[PDB]
Amino acid sequence: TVEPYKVNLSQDLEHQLQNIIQELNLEILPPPEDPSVPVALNIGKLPSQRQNQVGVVPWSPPQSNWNPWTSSNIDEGPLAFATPEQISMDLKNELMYQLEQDHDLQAILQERELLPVKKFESEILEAISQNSVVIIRGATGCGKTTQVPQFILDDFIQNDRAAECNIVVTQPRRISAVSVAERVAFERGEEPGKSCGYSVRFESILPRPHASIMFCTVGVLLRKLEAGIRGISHVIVDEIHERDINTDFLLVVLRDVVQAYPEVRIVLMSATIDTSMFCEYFFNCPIIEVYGRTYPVQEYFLEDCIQMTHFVPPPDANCNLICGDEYGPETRLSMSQLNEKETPFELIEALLKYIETLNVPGAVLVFLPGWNLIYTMQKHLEMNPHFGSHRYQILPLHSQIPREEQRKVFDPVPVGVTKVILSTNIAETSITINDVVYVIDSCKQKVKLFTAHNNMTNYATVWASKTNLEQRKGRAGRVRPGFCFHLCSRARFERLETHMTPEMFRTPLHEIALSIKLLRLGGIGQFLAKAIEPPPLDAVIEAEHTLRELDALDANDELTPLGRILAKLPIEPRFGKMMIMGCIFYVGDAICTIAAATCFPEPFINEGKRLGYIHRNFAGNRFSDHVALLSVFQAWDDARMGGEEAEIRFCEHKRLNMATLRMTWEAKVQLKEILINSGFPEDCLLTQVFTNTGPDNNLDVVISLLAFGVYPNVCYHKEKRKILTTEGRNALIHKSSVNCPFSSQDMKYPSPFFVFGEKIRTRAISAKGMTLVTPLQLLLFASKKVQSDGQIVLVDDWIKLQISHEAAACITGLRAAMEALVVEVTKQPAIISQLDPVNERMLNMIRQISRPSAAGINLMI
Numbered sequence: 001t002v003e004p005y006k007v008n009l010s011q012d013l014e015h016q017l018q019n020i021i022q023e024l025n026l027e028i029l030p031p032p033e034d035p036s037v038p039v040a041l042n043i044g045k046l047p048s049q050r051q052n053q054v055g056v057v058p059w060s061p062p063q064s065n066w067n068p069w070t071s072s073n074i075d076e077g078p079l080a081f082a083t084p085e086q087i088s089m090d091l092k093n094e095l096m097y098q099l100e101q102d103h104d105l106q107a108i109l110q111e112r113e114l115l116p117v118k119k120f121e122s123e124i125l126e127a128i129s130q131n132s133v134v135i136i137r138g139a140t141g142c143g144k145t146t147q148v149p150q151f152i153l154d155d156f157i158q159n160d161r162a163a164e165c166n167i168v169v170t171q172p173r174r175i176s177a178v179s180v181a182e183r184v185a186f187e188r189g190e191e192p193g194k195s196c197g198y199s200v201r202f203e204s205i206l207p208r209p210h211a212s213i214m215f216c217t218v219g220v221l222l223r224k225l226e227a228g229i230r231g232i233s234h235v236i237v238d239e240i241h242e243r244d245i246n247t248d249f250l251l252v253v254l255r256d257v258v259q260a261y262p263e264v265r266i267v268l269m270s271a272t273i274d275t276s277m278f279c280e281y282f283f284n285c286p287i288i289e290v291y292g293r294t295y296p297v298q299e300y301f302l303e304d305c306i307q308m309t310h311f312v313p314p315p316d317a318n319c320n321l322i323c324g325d326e327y328g329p330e331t332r333l334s335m336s337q338l339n340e341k342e343t344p345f346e347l348i349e350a351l352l353k354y355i356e357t358l359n360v361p362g363a364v365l366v367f368l369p370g371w372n373l374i375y376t377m378q379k380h381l382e383m384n385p386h387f388g389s390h391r392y393q394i395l396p397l398h399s400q401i402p403r404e405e406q407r408k409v410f411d412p413v414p415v416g417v418t419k420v421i422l423s424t425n426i427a428e429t430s431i432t433i434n435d436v437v438y439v440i441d442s443c444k445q446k447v448k449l450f451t452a453h454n455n456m457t458n459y460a461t462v463w464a465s466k467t468n469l470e471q472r473k474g475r476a477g478r479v480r481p482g483f484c485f486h487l488c489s490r491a492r493f494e495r496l497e498t499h500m501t502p503e504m505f506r507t508p509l510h511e512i513a514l515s516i517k518l519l520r521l522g523g524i525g526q527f528l529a530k531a532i533e534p535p536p537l538d539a540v541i542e543a544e545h546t547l548r549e550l551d552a553l554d555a556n557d558e559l560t561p562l563g564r565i566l567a568k569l570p571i572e573p574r575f576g577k578m579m580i581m582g583c584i585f586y587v588g589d590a591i592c593t594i595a596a597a598t599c600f601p602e603p604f605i606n607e608g609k610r611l612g613y614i615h616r617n618f619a620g621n622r623f624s625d626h627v628a629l630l631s632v633f634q635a636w637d638d639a640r641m642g643g644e645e646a647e648i649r650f651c652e653h654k655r656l657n658m659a660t661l662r663m664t665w666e667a668k669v670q671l672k673e674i675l676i677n678s679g680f681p682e683d684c685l686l687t688q689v690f691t692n693t694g695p696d697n698n699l700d701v702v703i704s705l706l707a708f709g710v711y712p713n714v715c716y717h718k719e720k721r722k723i724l725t726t727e728g729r730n731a732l733i734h735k736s737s738v739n740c741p742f743s744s745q746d747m748k749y750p751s752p753f754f755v756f757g758e759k760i761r762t763r764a765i766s767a768k769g770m771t772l773v774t775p776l777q778l779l780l781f782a783s784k785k786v787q788s789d790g791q792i793v794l795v796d797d798w799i800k801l802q803i804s805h806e807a808a809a810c811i812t813g814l815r816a817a818m819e820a821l822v823v824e825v826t827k828q829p830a831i832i833s834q835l836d837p838v839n840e841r842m843l844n845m846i847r848q849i850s851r852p853s854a855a856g857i858n859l860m861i
């Protein structure tokens, strides 16, 4: 229930808009006969592709003249025209001397031989040599991840077959691929570069071309499969029990490879779960069990956690209201006062003080869901002097901090000092800490539930499974009889699911859909039906629909020249098309910069409620987080000119996370590299200088293209922090955003329209990373449906605009004209440098309506 926002654009512009759509051969659809029935201004996009069938990804064993990682030959170098025998012998002789000379490596080998998996080495190597596929089931902390790959390599080194061994290991997470590669490197007295290289998204330290272990993510591997798995002996799919969507999709591919090429060796590695599902899938492959030192863990629940602490809190069916009558009268009362949706931060402090009163030295492992709640818990404790450097050592563990800090969890602490690890679900199965005796469990999980109908990326904190709680408890009993503190009532444990819902059921498939087509694996639905647990129908339909809109797929659901580029780009297909459109407007670098910076957390550091002057000053008068992001990036790139220390002193002074800006940059260069290879010229991807205050037409175009990329994320500002969503529901501007004002203040915007990055609903709807746009930019790129009565126009059944019917039908025309050019450009990206004279004015007219002045707006007020 809002007024129609008027648009005071010049008559000069209206002529120019009408002039070009006439030249483009696009008639304006006339006003309706009566205003009660509106007519849509939406123009349908302006070929018969051959039907695909069943096809398996090809395989070939390791060679002596082939580098499997670079996927090319070895003409130059010492291992160029070497014999398989010369190599295998040299690689052994190299290892023989290293094991005798280095005494600090002998000390490391002596630790490797104590790990439970060691005694099974004989069985594992035998199982793999005989059977194509094998499952290596076993408890977390036995060393199946770190050792099994080495055993397989050493078995080929020591037996003089080292030239016939190249191992691929597929970790589900990003940090796990690096962490393990850096660990397995140290365990051979080397650095990653030599024998144990890695390759994650926008970061890779490739191994040597023979007798090597590549620790990559599944997504990285799938993108490099265009050719096929050429020059690889073993494929170790690690942490299958996590049920990562890409892991599940990979197992569908590998099953086809085992069937057609039974010489290859797959090695699935699972935790203590029901592996019968995977076993059956891979033709009842052997399940090599792995066990060792275990300890009985005395697990407690919220009833017991208030019983032995005498705790009292501050001022579906709620399970805290239920309580055993056997438990104390006050215990039952204290618990019922506590909310279930918020994790009890005060109770955790009381449990750390109970651990003290036992007088049994050991480290504490606190399982929280998000960094937001880990950063919360860390503050709470360090505010209390009792938890000081002399007495306590608190260490945060999540996949978004320096690897230096992630390694400090393993470092033994001074005697008397307690080590409390505020970790995520990373320390559940993927990695094991050795010092842990006591374990506190929130019994919560941070899952990315994406609904398509309203584009809601809800990071909901939902309850964990019985399998989660069972394996979180397991971490306690590795050193001694530990204690596990579950922060959920004995009633709530009953109303938990046996297992978690696999990602395959509750994730979008449009990224996997492209991969299927790119790898020529046939039909999207046809393939995904063969998955160990196929995805829901509606998710496949959604994915297929989502891709046909982008023109990534045709009517026959075959890969278009456009879609092929999107499949080769490791980003959201929509942000992939945005980048291509950037290359046409010669702002490709600026757009690549933005696209990249969505793969890492905002480089801005939090220092209170809202950002200070220094952080806001990057935003300028554009009222855009994305322009602030380019502004810091431009200012940071100039701070690198004066060497490495000048870079750090800038980052320090400006309160920026240097680690991010470098990873964001390295990503941008790789995004550029793929567009170049796809055909796009160098001249449209040059680091063009701009200003975030003065009139800049190139920056106007970047905000326009940005509106395209984030759609359907767009909102209307009413007052203060309150904004209206697409569905017509109220929402809050994120406290992080520059457009967020000070507590109870009036921010005066020259336009109420804002496209944004993430739509989050933790409690209420919060719009993060926002960018101001004009009514013209809204109609052009940030809207699909546009109806008109003659005076008013309706944009996706919300936001009414009192604007000329013609101008609206012209702007909606430019979109369809632009859409058509994207198709023509993707057939041959070279044509960007010499576009049609008619099409060069079409882009100039988009550049025109992109300007603030085009909607009668002046930012310098």
Ligand SMILES: Nc1ncnc2c1ncn2[C@@H]1O[C@H](COP(=O)(O)OP(=O)(O)O)[C@@H](O)[C@H]1O
Pocket: 115, 139, 140, 141, 142, 143, 144, 145, 146, 147, 183, 410, 429, 430, 431, 432, 433, 434
């Ligand atoms: N970075 C590391 N620092 C110290 N110990 C480590 C590290 N990585 C692994 N370990 C040790 O290796 C053993 C288990 O290794 P891992 O391969 O992660 O086990 P699994 O995959 O079977 O759970 C444990 O003793 C653990 O402490």
Ligand SMILES: CCn1nc(C(=O)Nc2cccc(NS(C)(=O)=O)c2)cc1C
Pocket: 068, 069, 070, 071, 168, 198, 199, 204, 206, 214, 216, 220, 221, 224, 225, 228, 229, 230, 231, 232
């Ligand atoms: C070209 C340099 N480069 N290489 C990689 C990479 O990770 N390659 C890789 C990964 C896993 C397996 C294989 N081999 S395969 C497909 O199974 O044949 C190859 C990343 C970068 C930048």
Ligand SMILES: [Mg+2]
Pocket: 144, 145, 238, 239, 429, 430, 431
């Ligand atoms: Mg593991």
